[PDB]
Enzyme design. Structure first.
Site, mmCIF file in Angstrom:
data_model
loop_
_atom_site.group_PDB
_atom_site.id
_atom_site.type_symbol
_atom_site.label_atom_id
_atom_site.label_comp_id
_atom_site.label_asym_id
_atom_site.label_seq_id
_atom_site.Cartn_x
_atom_site.Cartn_y
_atom_site.Cartn_z
ATOM 1 N N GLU A 197 -15.037 5.069 -21.068
ATOM 2 C CA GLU A 197 -14.837 6.226 -21.936
ATOM 3 C C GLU A 197 -14.443 7.552 -21.287
ATOM 4 O O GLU A 197 -13.773 8.373 -21.909
ATOM 5 C CB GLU A 197 -16.053 6.436 -22.872
ATOM 6 C CG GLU A 197 -16.357 5.224 -23.770
ATOM 7 C CD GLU A 197 -15.412 4.973 -24.935
ATOM 8 O OE1 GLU A 197 -14.457 5.853 -25.064
ATOM 9 O OE2 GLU A 197 -15.542 4.048 -25.709
ATOM 10 N N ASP A 223 -8.807 10.950 -29.378
ATOM 11 C CA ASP A 223 -8.837 9.626 -28.841
ATOM 12 C C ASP A 223 -7.455 8.920 -28.862
ATOM 13 O O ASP A 223 -6.468 9.565 -29.221
ATOM 14 C CB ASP A 223 -10.083 8.813 -29.231
ATOM 15 C CG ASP A 223 -10.038 8.146 -30.572
ATOM 16 O OD1 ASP A 223 -8.916 8.334 -31.216
ATOM 17 O OD2 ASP A 223 -10.956 7.488 -31.000
ATOM 18 N N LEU A 249 -17.270 9.779 -31.149
ATOM 19 C CA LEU A 249 -16.374 10.062 -32.246
ATOM 20 C C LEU A 249 -16.888 11.176 -33.165
ATOM 21 O O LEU A 249 -17.985 11.157 -33.676
ATOM 22 C CB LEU A 249 -16.175 8.849 -33.127
ATOM 23 C CG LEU A 249 -15.400 9.322 -34.350
ATOM 24 C CD1 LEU A 249 -13.954 9.609 -33.984
ATOM 25 C CD2 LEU A 249 -15.479 8.300 -35.469
ATOM 26 N N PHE A 255 -20.021 -0.366 -29.243
ATOM 27 C CA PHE A 255 -19.952 1.067 -29.086
ATOM 28 C C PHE A 255 -18.557 1.579 -29.488
ATOM 29 O O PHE A 255 -18.385 2.593 -30.149
ATOM 30 C CB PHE A 255 -20.215 1.334 -27.596
ATOM 31 C CG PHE A 255 -20.308 2.780 -27.233
ATOM 32 C CD1 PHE A 255 -19.160 3.498 -26.919
ATOM 33 C CD2 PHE A 255 -21.559 3.386 -27.140
ATOM 34 C CE1 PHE A 255 -19.255 4.839 -26.544
ATOM 35 C CE2 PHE A 255 -21.691 4.718 -26.764
ATOM 36 C CZ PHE A 255 -20.519 5.424 -26.472
ATOM 37 N N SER A 293 -14.305 -15.642 -32.228
ATOM 38 C CA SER A 293 -14.649 -15.389 -30.856
ATOM 39 C C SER A 293 -16.151 -15.473 -30.709
ATOM 40 O O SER A 293 -16.658 -15.956 -29.709
ATOM 41 C CB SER A 293 -14.270 -13.973 -30.470
ATOM 42 O OG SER A 293 -12.901 -13.744 -30.671
ATOM 43 N N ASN A 301 -9.057 -16.017 -27.283
ATOM 44 C CA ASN A 301 -9.152 -15.575 -28.654
ATOM 45 C C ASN A 301 -9.333 -14.074 -28.799
ATOM 46 O O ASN A 301 -8.785 -13.435 -29.710
ATOM 47 C CB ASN A 301 -10.302 -16.322 -29.355
ATOM 48 C CG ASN A 301 -10.331 -16.080 -30.853
ATOM 49 O OD1 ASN A 301 -11.140 -15.292 -31.395
ATOM 50 N ND2 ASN A 301 -9.414 -16.754 -31.540
#
Ligand SMILES: [Cl-]
Ligand SMILES: [Cl-]
EC number: 3.2.1.17
Length: 162
Positions: A11, A20, A32, A104, A117, A132
């Site tokens: 991040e 972002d 966010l 996250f 998956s 996948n």
């Protein structure tokens, strides 16, 4: 290496509101703030989250504080989630960290969506699940990060991060 370190690498750390990879207002360590194209809306959320008149800027301490909260909410979100919990429960420590990372970033709902998956991970079919995972908007948009998370799942080691 651990989850915080892991996510701090993925991040980064920005003390000033920025947009972002999808153009959303974020701040800190991937926190966010809002989807809404509005910076004031951004600033509003921001002050509301920190509890003071920020002017779009936060300190390190602040940033870390939001991060602690978010990492905690991500784990609790997984443990709360009917689809995620069992996946999580079946995994070793490193791989759990990878799941938290995905959560996250995209939210529990987003992740609960990798049905296929998830199933592969649960079944311990590492190479198949990796393949996948790659077939997704996620991988296509943020391929490097996606690759690190995918390798972690494939291997169960932190190599992708060293
Ligand atoms: Cl908050
Ligand atoms: Cl990336």
């Amino acid at each position: 290496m651990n989850i915080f370190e892991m996510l701090r690498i993925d991040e980064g750390l920005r003390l000033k509101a920025y947009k972002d990879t999808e153009g959303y207002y974020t701040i800190g360590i991937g926190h966010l703030l809002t989807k809404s194209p509005s910076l004031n809306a951004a600033k509003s959320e921001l002050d509301k989250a920190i509890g003071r008149n920020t002017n779009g800027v936060i300190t390190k301490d602040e940033a870390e504080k939001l991060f602690n909260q978010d990492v905690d909410a991500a784990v609790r979100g997984i443990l709360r989630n009917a689809k995620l919990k069992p996946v999580y429960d079946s995994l070793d420590a490193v791989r759990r960290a990878a799941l938290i990372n995905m959560v996250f970033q995209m939210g529990e709902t987003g992740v609960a969506g990798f049905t296929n998956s998830l199933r592969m991970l649960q079944q311990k079919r590492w190479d198949e699940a990796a393949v996948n995972l790659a077939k997704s908007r996620w991988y296509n948009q943020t391929p490097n990060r996606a690759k690190r998370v995918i390798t972690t799942f494939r291997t169960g080691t932190w190599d992708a991060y060293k």
